[PDB]
Amino acid sequence: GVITSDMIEMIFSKSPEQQLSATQKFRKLLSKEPNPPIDEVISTPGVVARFVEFLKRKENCTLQFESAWVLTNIASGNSLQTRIVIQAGAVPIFIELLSSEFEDVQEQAVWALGNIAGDSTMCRDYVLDCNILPPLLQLFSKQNRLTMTRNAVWALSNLCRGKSPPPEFAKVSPCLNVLSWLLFVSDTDVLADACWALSYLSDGPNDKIQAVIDAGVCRRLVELLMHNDYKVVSPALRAVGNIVTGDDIQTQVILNCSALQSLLHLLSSPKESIKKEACWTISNITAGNRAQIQTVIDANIFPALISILQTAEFRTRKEAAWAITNATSGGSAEQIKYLVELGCIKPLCDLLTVMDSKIVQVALNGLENILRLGEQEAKRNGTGINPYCALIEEAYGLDKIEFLQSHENQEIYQKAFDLIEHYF
Amino acid sequence: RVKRPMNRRKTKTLM
């Protein structure tokens, strides 16, 4: 039906003319937009191995090209369909083909390996075990072709992709330098996939983020936060937000690049995804020392966080709430004063009637920091009464705290009781 | 310490 007998005949014919004819018939039939017939070509036991064998024909450049195209498309399907390609032995042949004299061939080779490594952690690590990156990284030495550089950075991103489990870090870490100078390219696709690779490598312990910091990319990452195309801004924001998951020294590295300035702009972006990830980045920042909190203050971020907390979608409001709560946990007595001056009590109180229990606890401790500080200001005893006990009451705060007595969660209920007794 | 962490294939067509 879909695969005429003429095709298989020519495929196993020893005439290169007919070999090529049938191979490109397969190629065309696999370039179908809706659903190419991958299961149909796999159901003919001896064709996939036949294509693998065609890949070794250095004599003919066109034949390896068409066969690699066929195999890429087969490798673009389900996990079983690419396991067919793998256990047919195509990965080492493709890697050897990276060093080919013919440019079309090596482009298709890196594309095939990108699909294969983009399968799963097992395929990714298997392609790594075949020494893919030493010949893959030399491909960037030729800044001549663009399509090739795109395919190469995308395959790299696949090699870094995956967190369950992460790739062997020593196996993929040597690509950090090439990514480091790949951020200064003009093309948006290469920048986007380079930022994705950096975002994957930055997801891990402080050691891995310290390595990528030692690659010297934070400055260009933050400069890409202001990119016009969101295909670039999304992964760049993700990579920066990963770096700021480290200790104070390595997040201070991001701050020294003047990143808060552009994060403020991203707090107004129409895409709620970017708003959310920027709020998350800023929350991690405000979990640090008093100086990092203060540079968030001097960047005029908390006005925007309070606004976002009032009007944004709940997914975003969560990260905004974490931001201001973190600022209240380890902040100066004057910094939280700036916060309550800005009027953060009403948003936090507004967050108590919500379904999510964990961020209700967030708002609770963020209010308890203000209450405890206010009690500490009352400890001075210039005035006996806690000044914030009235400001939280004017916001209908203790009303919702009282309602939190009947809350199912024992943690929330008990905390509400402690607060109402200690401060009221 | 207080930090919260975060929480593939291309088909080729001539057309």
Author numbering:
A (entry chain A): 81 to 504
B (entry chain B): 40 to 46, 113 to 120
Give the authors' words.
SOX2 is essential for the neural development, and the self-renewal of undifferentiated embryonic and neural stem cells. SOX2 is one of the key factors required to convert somatic cells into induced pluripotent stem cells (PSCs), and in concert with Nanog and Oct4, plays a central role in embryonic stem cell maintenance. The localization of proteins to the nucleus via the classical import pathway is an active process and requires a cargo bearing an NLS to be recognized by importin-α (IMPα). Humans harbor seven IMPα isoforms (IMPα1–7), each containing an N-terminal IMPβ-binding domain (residues 1–70) and a C-terminal NLS-binding domain constructed from ten armadillo (ARM) repeats (residues 70–500).
To further probe the basis of isoform specificity, we solved the structures of SOX2 bound to both IMPα2 and IMPα5 (2.7 and 2.8 Å resolution respectively). Consistent with the cellular and in vitro binding data, we observed differences at the SOX2:IMPα isoform interfaces, with that from IMPα3 being more extensive. In comparison, the IMPα2:SOX2 interaction interface buried 1082 Å2 of surface area, and contained 4 salt bridges and 24 hydrogen bonds. The IMPα5:SOX2 interface buried 1106 Å2 of surface area, and contained 4 salt bridges and 23 hydrogen bonds. Although the overall structures of the IMPα isoforms were very similar (RMSD between IMPα3 with IMPα2 and IMPα5 of 1.5 and 1.9 Å, respectively), we found that the ARM 7 domain is positioned differently in IMPα3 compared to IMPα2 and IMPα5. This region is where the SOX2 HMG domain interacts with IMPα3, but this interaction was not observed in the IMPα2 and IMPα5 crystals, where instead the HMG domain appeared to be disordered. The position adopted by the ARM 7 domain in both IMPα2 and IMPα5 would generate a steric clash with SOX2 that could impair its binding. Furthermore, Pro106 of SOX2, that induces a sharp bend adjacent to the SOX-HMG domain, would clash with the main chain of both IMPα2 and α5 ARM 7. We performed a bead-binding assay using bacterially expressed His-tagged SOX2 immobilized on Ni2+ agarose that was able to bind IMPα3 directly, whereas IMPα1, α2, and α5 (same SF as IMPα7) bound more weakly.
